Amino acid sequence: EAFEETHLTSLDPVKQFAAWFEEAVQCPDIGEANAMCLATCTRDGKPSARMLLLKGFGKDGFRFFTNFESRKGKELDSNPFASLVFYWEPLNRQVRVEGPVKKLPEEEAECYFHSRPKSSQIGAVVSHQSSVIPDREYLRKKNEELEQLYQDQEVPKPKSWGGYVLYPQVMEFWQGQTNRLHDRIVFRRGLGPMTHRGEEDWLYERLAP
């Protein structure tokens, strides 16, 4: 029940994420363990947030796919900094990740896009994500028309559709407790008596709940 510095799986917070993520995936009361909230903002400090799915992770960071012309994509292109929240209610656990964002190479975005179901590919060609549209019939009609156009052909990836990778600068591991005296172990890239060395350029510290 205690979450303690001496029982970390790893002092590389990406590997500690992998350990917790695996526990979430193994939990039958968790539906999408890779659902996350992505927080973005304008350069002038106006924040926004939405659910997204994590599509891959490792040393270079946390990957996701979206339309670059969406509201989030205009913010990320103008202000390439973001934060992620993973919340696993049945495990009483939260993971926060903060870092800069860059676009994935076009070739990786093409490969990912053509791995999706064909109906989802056509949906991305239909949708100018976050633009105002008249009604839901507009989507249904254009979808049906593109189904006809792409019968027995490859669906081209929209130029505006692709991926981002968030390179972690801060990773917080949160475990809920009674009385709201939660356990918080927070890794940051970088020594005071409360600051500890992790792997590579990582440091970690406990934060008050």
Ligand X SMILES: Cc1cc2nc3c(=O)[nH]c(=O)nc-3n(C[C@H](O)[C@H](O)[C@H](O)COP(=O)(O)O)c2cc1C
Told to check if 51 binds a second copy by CB under 8 A, we report yes
CA distance 84 to 65: 14
Phi, then psi, of 151 in degrees rounded to 5: -50, 125
Exactly one of 9, 25, 47, 115 binds a second copy (CB under 8 A); which one?
47
* Size of site (CB under 6 A) for ligand X: 19
130 annotated as a binding-site residue: yes
Distances (CA, A) of 141 to 123, 144, 151, 169: 11, 5, 16, 44
CA distance 96 to 26: 20
Told to check if 132 binds a second copy by CB under 8 A, we report yes
Told to check if 191 binds a second copy by CB under 8 A, we report no
180 a catalytic residue: yes
Helix (H, G, I), strand (E, B), or coil: what is residue 174?
A: strand
Q: Which is nearer to ligand A1H16, 78 or 120 (CB)?
A: 120
11 annotated as a binding-site residue: no
DSSP string for residues in 81-121: EEEEEEEEGGGTEEEEEEEEEEEPPHHHHHHHHHHS-HHHH
Count CB neighbours of 173 within 10 A: 21
Q: Considering only the stretches 12-20, 102-110, 156-164, 172-180, report the one whose residues sit in contact with a second copy under the rule CB under 8 A.
A: 172-180
CB of 162 to ligand A1H16, least distance (A): 11
Interface pattern 90-129 for ligand X (x via CB under 6 A)? ----x----------------------------------x
Which of 96, 180, 188, 197 is catalytic? The answer is 180
146 binds, among ligand A1H16, a second copy, ligand X, none (CB under 5 to 8 A by kind): none
116 annotated as a binding-site residue: yes
Q: Which is nearer to ligand X, 94 or 121 (CB)?
A: 94
Told to check if 156 binds ligand A1H16 by CB under 6 A, we report no
Name the CA radius of gyration of the chain, rounded.
Answer: 20
Told to check if 26 binds a second copy by CB under 8 A, we report no
Residues of span 57-76 touching ligand A1H16 by CB under 6 A: 65
Residues in CB range of 64: below 8 A, 6 or more apart: 36, 38, 52, 53, 54, 55, 163, 164, 166
Q: Considering only the stretches 17-25, 55-63, 106-114, 178-186, report the one whose residues sit in contact with a second copy under the rule CB under 8 A.
A: 178-186
CA distance 125 to 158: 6
Residue type, 95: V
Residues assigned a catalytic role: 180
